[PDB]
Amino acid sequence: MPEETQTQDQPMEEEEVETFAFQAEIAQLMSLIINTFYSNKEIFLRELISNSSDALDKIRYESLTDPSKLDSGKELHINLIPNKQDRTLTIVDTGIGMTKADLINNLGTIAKSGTKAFMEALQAGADISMIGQFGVGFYSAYLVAEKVTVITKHNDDEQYAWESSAGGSFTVRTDTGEPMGRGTKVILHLKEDQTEYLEERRIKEIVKKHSQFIGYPITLFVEKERDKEVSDDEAEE
């Protein structure tokens, strides 16, 4: 064998990771949306739930091609759990699945010079409340969220932690923490300085009414109730 290796592991000291930034046209979109200000528009709650269901809708069709994940049913469902300690609304599911090629192929910021056509329509026709529906701007969430982090766990593939928030600069780096096998963890970072957004009661009914009794299992986390379980919460200061 070679002469050991030790517990040392460092790819690059300088810069360390791979980052990119489209500071031009995409930065114009970003500046046009930030000047809209955080006026709170929960319309996105409907837009994103449609997108989430859309990804399960695709794998639903793919289940006819490959029924391997339909063999048992270990996952493949809508899990919506808010981590009060992490201030992140965690949406975890398997979805139809994505590969590393989909990421670099620009899963986001898919405007790329075609932004002018949409800009024209946005100038005289439609407003920003439709950009997510076209799948070219899921950054509509920035109106009520500040950071979006996507970590992918590996299984017969590689794993990466990709993120973005604003500006138009994103980063890709490999992960080294295994809390799951192979899953897409969508953690939405709440800007605590604006909204708690951790009202389990509203979130419970809001998804219930919007589901309209859909034929799929949903796992929603809640906050501590009172009976057998007990934990303190700081509401009064």
From Swiss-Prot:
PTM sites of type Phosphothreonine: T5, T7
Posttranslational mods: ISGylated.
N6-acetyllysine found at: K58, K84
Phenotype when changing D93A: Impaired ATP-binding. Strong interaction with HIF1A, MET, KEAP1 and RHOBTB2. Loss of interaction with HSF1 and ERBB2. Los of interaction with TSC1
Location(s) in or outside the cell: Nucleus; Cytoplasm; Melanosome; Cell membrane
Region (Interaction with NR3C1): 9-236
Modified residues (Phosphoserine): S231
Binding residue positions for ATP: N51, D93, K112, F138
Summary of subunit composition and partner proteins: Homodimer. Identified in NR3C1/GCR steroid receptor-chaperone complexes formed at least by NR3C1, HSP90AA1 and a variety of proteins containing TPR repeats such as FKBP4, FKBP5, PPID, PPP5C or STIP1. Forms a complex containing HSP90AA1, TSC1 and TSC2; TSC1 is required to recruit TCS2 to the complex. The closed form interacts (via the middle domain and TPR repeat-binding motif) with co-chaperone TSC1 (via C-terminus). Interacts with TOM34. Interacts with TERT; the interaction, together with PTGES3, is required for correct assembly and stabilization of the TERT holoenzyme complex.
Family of this protein: Belongs to the heat shock protein 90 family.
Protein name as it appears in the record: Heat shock protein HSP 90-alpha
Species the sequence originates in: Homo sapiens
